[PDB]
Ligand binder design. Structure first.
Ligand code: CLA
Ligand code: CLA
Ligand code: CLA
Ligand code: CLA
Ligand code: CLA
Ligand code: CLA
Ligand code: CLA
Ligand code: CLA
Ligand SMILES: CCCCCCCCCCCCCCCC(=O)OC[C@H](COP(=O)(O)OC[C@@H](O)CO)OC(=O)CCCCCCCCCCCCCCC
Ligand SMILES: CC1=C(/C=C/C(C)=C/C=C/C(C)=C/C=C/C=C(C)/C=C/C=C(C)/C=C/C2=C(C)CCCC2(C)C)C(C)(C)CCC1
Ligand code: SF4
Ligand code: SF4
Lengths: 733, 165, 64, 40, 144, 80, 75, 37
């Protein structure tokens, strides 16, 4: 039999091409490998994580190397407002001379790509000023990548493999990760800001060659050890400060100004220094909570066992959950993806409205790409969070050990949960779609005053509480007599209120009826996607149509045409259907973010306010209007620098449409077609001399759903990425 | 006014919008005769347009910078400033009709469950019974509440089939 | 002398049955000591179109 | 005639009459009360 | 009843031939032979496509996979009321007999058969997947 | 090879055996049902996974179950 | 098949009837090159009367692309 | 010291785009087809 795959004898004995496809697709499902034990499972995962870490630091090293080698960082730092950053050089032998000239720009030697990832603003903010600064960072991270790779090898060796119990020491790992991984890293990052980043923003060079002889503050550690910590907040950078120079600069290293630096339109460095110092203290303290070898602290099992409501409303409460979580990796992975997935959305939300990197706001293409980038990654991570929660129920859930606790009771009323998610999705869809169609008919008939425009009073009321005085609510921070206004009037409100009431920045943009409709469409996306994913998890173990679904696993094709038909009945298929709704939801979010910002960046916000209340405005004034430059990247008269995005735009449409083939036409048609191809090859003279070793067969039922979904997603992403960058960059960049 | 809005009766953009719509209608009018069929139809449209803009201003709606009416949904703000007719009152108008339709259908469904062949009473409607239940549904909120308090609104958990768990 | 009477109504208690927690009419009860003697008929068919099924003595209880 | 009235009681026939009636009522209301946006 | 012995020289039906017949698999892995007795010459439908005339008396056909042989068996049995039997033939010359395994078609109960893959429980009494985890291979709760 | 299991709710209707298009199943004597016969799966190496047997089983839930497993020339239904 | 034929005649009858009662065919005959054919008129409800466009011949209606005016002239 | 030569793309782009893929595909094709002892 064939060697590959070495981890499954069932696959290795398969004489068809399914062996190749399935061997690739089951490589990282360690639980399903032949001869796998629990202890070996954890040691493989531990080694794999070292490999992922090494790739991350190598990928970062490659970015640093290419910007220094081929970028214009040293030129960009001089005039960041009027210089486009360079990502890397182009060496494409297929280019014609017009293409070579078209992509030559920014004073570069030859053709180059313009960066959109914002690494220039990030690196410039943290104190990088020269190409040698980037070179040393690149070599340092390449070395760090090597060390992690060695550690992955080291801990696979006979005397360094951790035992099973080592991976299940919950109290000790939480203490270290909270205090050391989070707390000390944030404390160290405060050191960089105080010692390097802040001085560099004031025109003073600080490097490894002289940082031991430079005083971060005129009073060196006397305020710190004497408790007079307020001395570090005196004489902050003035409003006239020019970033990177000593004119208008101050001396404070810890402040709470609370606003935006007037020139760079980004958060103050002294606030970001005090921010990281504050959480570092909290995280270091929080890391002394759990039990270890020293006889103090909590044991997490005791905490869970205690929290059972005395009235029996939650049944057994949280009894038995410690083993349920501590013994299942899919439960832990589901909690990790759910938490990280939400934080990825939070990063996108806060970075566009509180830009932390100098000159990030003015780079419109970078801001658009960064928000879209992280929202699509958050969407995928959330779908994975529910997928592994569904896998937990099939593989790791033990009904006997969870008898009567909160987790078991979720399955008890799963119909109630699913029924109410169904109602909310239907309600939002009916009325959200209905109001849009109503407004479209009114616009078509020429009566824009007959449409249903609902003011977002609840959201506009929140903005009033934060100090936005446009709506006249005179509430909390919007009223100058409230205690909330007075107490903070000496710490951060003067800066915060100044920024929130500036209508040229993205801090709490003004909202109207157009924002009301879009937000309710977003809610429909979140609820429907949750409905599909939640049903896939709660019904994973069985249903009326298939009472014993657990005996078949997480992913199987179907149960056949009997009992009416069971296509797409596994929990794997519920995730597969939910990915479509996730793309649809994130698409609505990113269209809304992009269009509302293009109108702001052009100064004509009235277009969004008027055209966003009906769906023809989106199609006409956003998709059709902003495609004009994209599709002219190359035309019968020539081409320009946008021809790559024009080409990628159609490239996306093709991959997307190809995915329809794997999703619409199913296996039986193709297997019978391949059988005539097998006949044709064997009877053809001069070709039947050559022969195959793996019998050709059609893709499997499950494989084609993944392959179709992969093409659908890739075409989805590449189409909008090309349009997002091209429309934003050509308009302003 | 509320949320920075202004009454449509006092809105400059709102007034300008009416002129634009009437101007469009007038432009088409001058290509016909005085009392021809097309001219009469266009004049009727202009009368409705003028009436519509007077009614919305008379109703005391709020117009934004777009000069288009906006509706207030918070019950407190609606009752505070006399906007109850935009969303708040229509909210209880719809629920009465929606409960009427749902309650009537539920009564009919229970009525035929007692018959020998309930399935044949669903494809082929028992019109005499349906009309009887249609009229009695006007008091559904009273009947609906009394069922809830007597405990006959919901089935017992033990009489409902559920999947293995 | 074993099982419920013919024609009586019973409630099904097999969790994997389509008619779990539902009432059916007893058609006959085998007296030969077979595993599942009780035969029950239902007015609503299952996903396969069947309206009858065999149950053990302890899987069926009298209506209420 | 009993069978014919039974045919008129079938679901498709009832729905056609019912929605024809329901639609007509709504159309007629908007004919005499054009452009309703607020209860007033 | 005794296991029949295949006669390779048995005459075959009158068939022109088609492109739906045996492939290179028959020469390397295996093929299947079906034989039966015909009361009179008659036209039947080949599972590979087309129509063939069965000679009166013994008939023999060769097919590429087992399902094709048992598809023809269903036709001959149900419509023409014959009683066919087919074998598995290997390239080395070995011949394996099956259907009927014991001479009686499986639909009819016969003494001497030993139950196989019979679980003395219901589907709802299987253990949970967690209890058959790390058993060396992907194993369903039904297997144990 | 696929896995085929017969459970003790079988009533010996023989419909699964008739439905099977590869002669995988057969009926054997039994004492656990009125028909005094039970389905058997002695030749699962020829099973292709069509699940025609499950379509034909009257009992609820099924008394014959097919769990698709390792693939091969026979189970993949190849004639080449 | 008789039912299908009967339905086509109702459909054909409607096309000829709407040409007689709700069309500008007579005006079109005089000025075929400047007047747009139209044989459907909508009622003035919920503001849909805007669909009655200016087609020529002192007539308001939906412009048709079925070519019935050209067929009638030829016959 | 770090700056690579100006001719580096001319060698590495063909090397990583045409040469290493050819050897990688040949290595993988032989590996998957290889039969167990
Ligand atoms: C102080 C001691 C210490 C430290 C520093 C670490 C560190 C680490 N451990 Mg842990 N570990 C410890 C003790 C420690 N461990 C002990 C005592 C045990 C035994 C009980 C373990 C057992 C253990 C296991 C079993 C595993 C780890 C793993 C890891 C790694 C997790 C992945 C990672 O890099 O996350 C980095 C995370 C952060 C820096 C924080 C993320 C969250 C913040 C809030 C995100 C946002 C921050 C900021 C805004 C981002 C800026 C971005 C920039 C672009 C601007 C990490 C290197 C895993 C690993 O990868 O191993 C190779 C792993 O499998 N550890
Ligand atoms: C850190 C998070 C994490 C980790 C450790 C795992 C780990 C695992 N997951 Mg999970 N998963 C995650 C995130 C994670 N997942 C996310 C984010 C999602 C949502 C998308 C999922 C959704 C998911 C599903 C639905 C399933 C798993 C499964 C698995 C297991 C097998 C994986 C495998 O064999 O892949 C093999 C890898 C492949 C076949 C290829 C993966 C690449 C895909 C197809 C995209 C390729 C795009 C391509 C590069 C684009 C080219 C563009 C072109 C222009 C060049 C394994 C335990 C499977 C399992 O067995 O669960 C029990 C399973 O069913 N995961
Ligand atoms: C534009 C495409 C589209 C639309 C409109 C919908 C709509 C719907 N999907 Mg679907 N879906 C789509 C694409 C779409 N999906 C795709 C591509 C996939 C991937 C396979 C899925 C996968 C999917 C899943 C897995 C689920 C849904 C669900 C839903 C429902 C969500 C709740 C809702 O909006 O209720 C409001 C209803 C609507 C907006 C539907 C349209 C209503 C129209 C406008 C009514 C018109 C009536 C009018 C009288 C005219 C009739 C004329 C006729 C008689 C001739 C809804 C029925 C969920 C569901 O069923 O929840 C209950 C669900 O679980 N969808
Ligand atoms: C859907 C949720 C929701 C939300 C976000 C709001 C929001 C608001 N409501 Mg409304 N309200 C709602 C539902 C809601 N309401 C419902 C269901 C009812 C009952 C039908 C009311 C009845 C109501 C009244 C009677 C009043 C408001 C008022 C307000 C405003 C300030 C007080 C408040 O409610 O704070 C946040 C909301 C909540 C925490 C939810 C419960 C709110 C209760 C029901 C009303 C609280 C009124 C408050 C004590 C008034 C004090 C005086 C005020 C000037 C500070 C604010 C714009 C007040 C107003 O007009 O301010 C200008 C006011 O007088 N609401
Ligand atoms: C969410 C769905 C939705 C909602 C809430 C509305 C709401 C409204 N639409 Mg709109 N519309 C929708 C969907 C919707 N539409 C769709 C999908 C379309 C496309 C077909 C349209 C096309 C449309 C048109 C063309 C018109 C409206 C109009 C109206 C108004 C009708 C008022 C009326 O008839 O009072 C009548 C009064 C009643 C009391 C009716 C109920 C009668 C019962 C018997 C009362 C019983 C009480 C106890 C109202 C503001 C009209 C308008 O002027 O809007 C400003 C109008 O001309 N709509
Ligand atoms: C293919 C067949 C066909 C179609 C699609 C139509 C369609 C139409 N006809 Mg026409 N009509 C047809 C055949 C057809 N007709 C025939 C054969 C005759 C001869 C009896 C007529 C006689 C006729 C008259 C007399 C009128 C129409 C009118 C109408 C319109 C409104 C119908 C309505 O809502 O009635 C109401 C709905 C119900 C009773 C239900 C509509 C565009 C009306 C129109 O265009 O007014 C401006 C109108 O007045 N039709
Ligand atoms: C994962 C990180 C990464 C990525 C995605 C890229 C991507 C690219 N590199 Mg770069 N490169 C990186 C890291 C990376 N590089 C590092 C760490 C070094 C230092 C050794 C280099 C040195 C380097 C050179 C010398 C050249 C490129 C070039 C290229 C381009 C063509 C591919 C090529 O020839 O690679 C070649 C990659 C290497 C020689 C190093 C690979 C190291 C890993 C561990 C294997 C492409 C834009 C070419 C270019 O700019 O064309 C215009 C080119 O000539 N890279
Ligand atoms: C990074 C990958 C890559 C690279 C470096 C190239 C490079 C090239 N491609 Mg492209 N190509 C690629 C990927 C790539 N392609 C892919 C993925 C596709 C499919 C979508 C194509 C499809 C494609 C087509 C259809 C064509 C090209 C052509 C070309 C040539 C254009 C410039 C020219 O005028 O050459 C002129 C070329 C020469 C003067 C000769 C160069 C050297 C030859 C090709 C090999 C010499 C070998 C040597 C004698 C012995 C072995 C040495 C070795 C062991 C070191 C050039 C050789 C064009 C061409 O001319 O191809 C031959 C052409 O028609 N490519
Ligand atoms: C007029 C004055 C009306 C006062 C009504 C007081 C009701 C108290 C709750 C009983 C509720 C009750 O019966 O609790 C019972 C149950 C708690 O279960 P336990 O088993 O822990 O406790 C049972 C107790 O009855 C006795 O220990 O909680 C719930 O079901 C909902 C809890 C809501 C918790 C709300 C938190 C606070 C949110 C903010 C609310 C506004 C602030 C003021 C109200 C707290
Ligand atoms: C199925 C399943 C699963 C999964 C799950 C998931 C995936 C979930 C998710 C979830 C989520 C994703 C959630 C979230 C949540 C959130 C929240 C709950 C939030 C909250 C917040 C707050 C409370 C806030 C507050 C505030 C404000 C608002 C303002 C100011 C400040 C403060 C803080 C005060 C698992 C694994 C378990 C396993 C089993 C099964
Ligand atoms: S498994 Fe089903 S079809 Fe087969 S004999 Fe038993 S009851 Fe009959
Ligand atoms: S799955 Fe198909 S081949 Fe296998 S036993 Fe059932 S009917 Fe026979």
């Amino acid at each position: 039999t064939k060697l590959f795959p070495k981890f499954s004898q069932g696959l290795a004995q398969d004489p068809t091409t399914r062996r190749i496809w399935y061997g690739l697709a089951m490589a990282h499902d360690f639980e399903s490998h032949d001869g796998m034990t629990e202890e070996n499972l954890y040691q493989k995962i531990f080694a794999s994580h070292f490999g992922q870490l090494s790739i991350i630091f190598l990928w970062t090293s490659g970015n640093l190397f290419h910007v220094a080698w081929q970028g214009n960082f040293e030129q960009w730092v001089t005039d960041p407002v009027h210089i486009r950053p360079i990502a890397h050089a182009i060496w494409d032998p297929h280019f014609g001379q017009p293409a070579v000239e078209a992509f030559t720009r920014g004073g570069a030697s030859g053709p180059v790509n313009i960066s959109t990832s914002g690494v220039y603003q990030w690196w410039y903010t943290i104190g990088m000023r020269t190409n040698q600064d980037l070179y040393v960072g690149s070599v340092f991270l390449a070395l760090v990548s090597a060390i992690f790779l060695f550690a992955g090898w080291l801990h696979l060796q006979p005397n360094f493999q951790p035992s099973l119990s080592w991976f299940k020491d919950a109290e000790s790992r939480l203490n270290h990760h909270l205090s050391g991984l989070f707390g000390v890293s944030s404390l160290a990052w405060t050191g960089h800001l105080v010692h390097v980043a802040i001085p560099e923003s004031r025109g003073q060079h600080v490097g490894w060659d002289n940082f031991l002889s430079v005083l971060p503050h005129p009073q060196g550690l006397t305020p710190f050890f004497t408790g007079n910590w307020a001395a570090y907040a005196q004489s902050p950078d003035t409003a006239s400060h020019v970033f990177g120079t000593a004119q208008g600069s101050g001396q404070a290293i810890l402040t709470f100004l609370g606003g935006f630096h007037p020139q760079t339109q980004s958060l103050w460095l002294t606030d970001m220094a005090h921010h990281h110092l504050a959480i570092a203290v909290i995280f270091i303290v929080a890391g002394h909570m759990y039990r270890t070898n020293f006889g103090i602290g909590h044991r997490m099992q005791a905490i869970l066992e205690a929290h059972t409501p005395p009235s029996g409303s939650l049944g057994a409460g949280h009894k038995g959950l410690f083993d349920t979580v501590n013994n299942s990796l899919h439960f832990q992975l589901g909690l990790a993806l759910a938490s990280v997935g939400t934080i990825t959305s939070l990063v996108a939300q806060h970075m566009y409205s509180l830009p932390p990197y100098a000159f990030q706001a003015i780079d419109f293409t970078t801001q658009a790409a960064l928000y879209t980038h992280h929202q699509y990654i958050a969407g995928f991570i959330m779908c994975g969070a529910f997928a592994h929660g569904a896998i937990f129920f099939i593989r790791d859930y033990d009904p006997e050990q969870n008898k009567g606790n909160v987790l078991a009771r979720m399955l008890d009323h799963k119909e109630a949960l699913i029924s109410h998610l169904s109602w909310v999705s239907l309600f939002l869809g009916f009325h959200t779609l209905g109001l849009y169609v109503h407004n479209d008919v009114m616009q078509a008939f020429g009566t824009p005053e007959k449409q249903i425009l609902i003011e977002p009073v609840f959201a506009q009321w929140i903005q009033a509480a934060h100090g936005k005085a446009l709506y006249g609510f005179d509430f909390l921070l919007s009223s100058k007599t409230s205690a909330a206004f007075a107490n903070g009037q000496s710490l951060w409100l003067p800066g915060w209120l100044d920024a929130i009431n500036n209508n040229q920045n993205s801090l709490f943009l003004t909202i109207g009826p157009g924002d009301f409709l879009v937000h309710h469409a977003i809610a429909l996306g979140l609820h429907t996607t949750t409905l599909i994913l939640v049903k896939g998890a709660l019904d994973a173990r069985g249903s009326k149509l298939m009472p014993d679904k657990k005996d078949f696993g997480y992913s199987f094709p179907c149960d056949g045409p009997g009992r009416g038909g069971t296509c797409d009945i596994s929990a794997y298929d519920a995730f597969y259907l939910a990915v479509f709704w996730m793309l649809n939801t994130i698409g609505w979010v990113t269209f809304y973010w992009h269009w509302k910002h293009l109108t702001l960046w052009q100064g004509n916000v009235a277009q969004f306010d008027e055209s966003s209340t009906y769906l023809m405005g989106w199609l006409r004034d956003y998709l059709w209007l902003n495609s004009s430059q994209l599709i002219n990247g190359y035309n019968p008269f020539g081409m320009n620098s946008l021809s790559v995005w024009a080409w990628t735009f159609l490239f996306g449409h093709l991959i997307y449409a190809t995915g329809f083939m794997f999703l619409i036409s199913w296996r039986g048609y193709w297997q019978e077609l391949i059988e005539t191809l097998v006949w044709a090859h064997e009877k053809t003279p001069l070709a039947n001399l050559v022969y195959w070793k793996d019998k050709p067969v059609a893709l499997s039922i499950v494989q084609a759903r993944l392959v179709g979904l992969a093409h659908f997603s890739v075409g989805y992403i590449f189409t909008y990425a090309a349009f997002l960058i091209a429309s934003t960059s050509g308009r302003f960049g | 006014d509320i949320a920075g809005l202004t009454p449509c009766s006092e809105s400059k953009a709102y007034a300008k919008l009416e002129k634009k719509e009437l101007k469009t209608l007038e432009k088409r009018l001058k290509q016909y005769e005085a009392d021809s069929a097309p001219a009469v139809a266009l004049k009727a449209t202009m009368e409705r347009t003028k009436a519509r803009f007077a009614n919305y201003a008379k109703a005391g709606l709020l117009c934004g910078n777009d000069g288009l009416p906006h509706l207030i949904a918070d019950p407190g703000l609606a009752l505070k400033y006399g906007h109850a007719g935009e969303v708040f009152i229509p909210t209880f108008g719809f629920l009465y009709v929606a409960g009427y339709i749902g309650y009537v259908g539920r009564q009919y469904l229970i009525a035929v469950k007692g018959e020998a062949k309930p399935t044949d009473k669903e494809i082929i409607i028992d019109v005499p019974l349906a009309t009887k239940l249609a009229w009695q549904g006007a008091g559904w909120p009273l009947a609906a509440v009394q069922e809830l308090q007597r405990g006959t609104l919901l089935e017992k958990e033990e009489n409902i089939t559920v999947s293995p768990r | 002398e074993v099982g419920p009477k013919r024609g009586s109504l019973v409630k099904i208690l097999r969790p994997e049955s389509y008619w779990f927690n539902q009432v059916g009419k007893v058609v006959s009860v085998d007296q030969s000591g077979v595993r599942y003697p009780v035969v029950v008929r239902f007015e609503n068919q299952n996903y396969a179109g069947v309206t009858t099924n065999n149950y053990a003595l302890d899987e069926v209880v009298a209506a209420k | 005639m009993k069978d014919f009235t039974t045919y008129l009681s079938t679901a498709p026939v009832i729905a056609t009459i019912w929605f024809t009636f329901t639609a007509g009522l709504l159309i007629e209301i908007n004919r005499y009360f054009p452009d309703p946006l607020v209860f007033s | 009843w005794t296991v029949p012995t295949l006669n390779p020289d048995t005459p075959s039906p009158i068939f022109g031939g088609s492109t739906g017949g045996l492939l290179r698999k028959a020469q390397t892995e295996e093929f299947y032979v079906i034989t039966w007795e015909a009361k009179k010459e008659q036209i039947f439908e080949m599972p590979t496509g087309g129509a063939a005339i069965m000679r009166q008396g013994p008939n023999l056909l060769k097919f590429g996979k087992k399902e094709q042989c048992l598809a023809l068996t269903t036709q001959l049995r149900n419509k023409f009321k014959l009683t066919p039997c087919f074998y598995r033939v290997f390239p080395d010359g070995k011949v394996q007999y099956l259907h009927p395994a014991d001479g009686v078609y499986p639909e009819k109960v016969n003494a001497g058969r030993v139950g196989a893959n019979q679980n003395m429980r219901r589907i709802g009494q299987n253990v949970n997947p967690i209890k058959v985890k790390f058993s060396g291979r992907m194993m369903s709760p039904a297997e144990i | 090879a696929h896995i085929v299991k017969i459970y003790d709710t079988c009533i010996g209707c023989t419909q699964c055996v008739r439905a099977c298009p590869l002669d995988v199943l057969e009926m054997v004597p039994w004492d656990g049902c009125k028909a005094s016969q039970m389905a058997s799966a002695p030749r699962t190496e020829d099973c292709v996974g069509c699940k025609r047997c499950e379509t034909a089983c009257p009992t609820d839930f099924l008394s014959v179950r097919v769990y698709l497993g390792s693939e091969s020339t026979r189970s993949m239904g190849l004639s080449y | 098949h008789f039912g299908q034929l009967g339905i086509i005649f109702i459909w054909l009858s409607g096309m000829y009837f709407h040409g007689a009662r709700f069309s500008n065919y007579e005006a079109w005959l005089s000025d075929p090159t400047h007047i747009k054919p139209s044989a459907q008129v909508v009622w003035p409800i919920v503001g849909q009367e805007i669909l009655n466009g200016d087609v020529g011949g002192g007539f308001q209606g939906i412009q048709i692309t079925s070519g019935f005016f050209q067929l009638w002239r030829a016959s | 010291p770090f700056v690579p030569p100006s001719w580096a793309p001319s060698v590495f782009v063909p090397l990583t785009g045409l040469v290493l893929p050819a050897i990688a595909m040949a290595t993988l094709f032989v590996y998957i087809e290889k039969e167990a002892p």
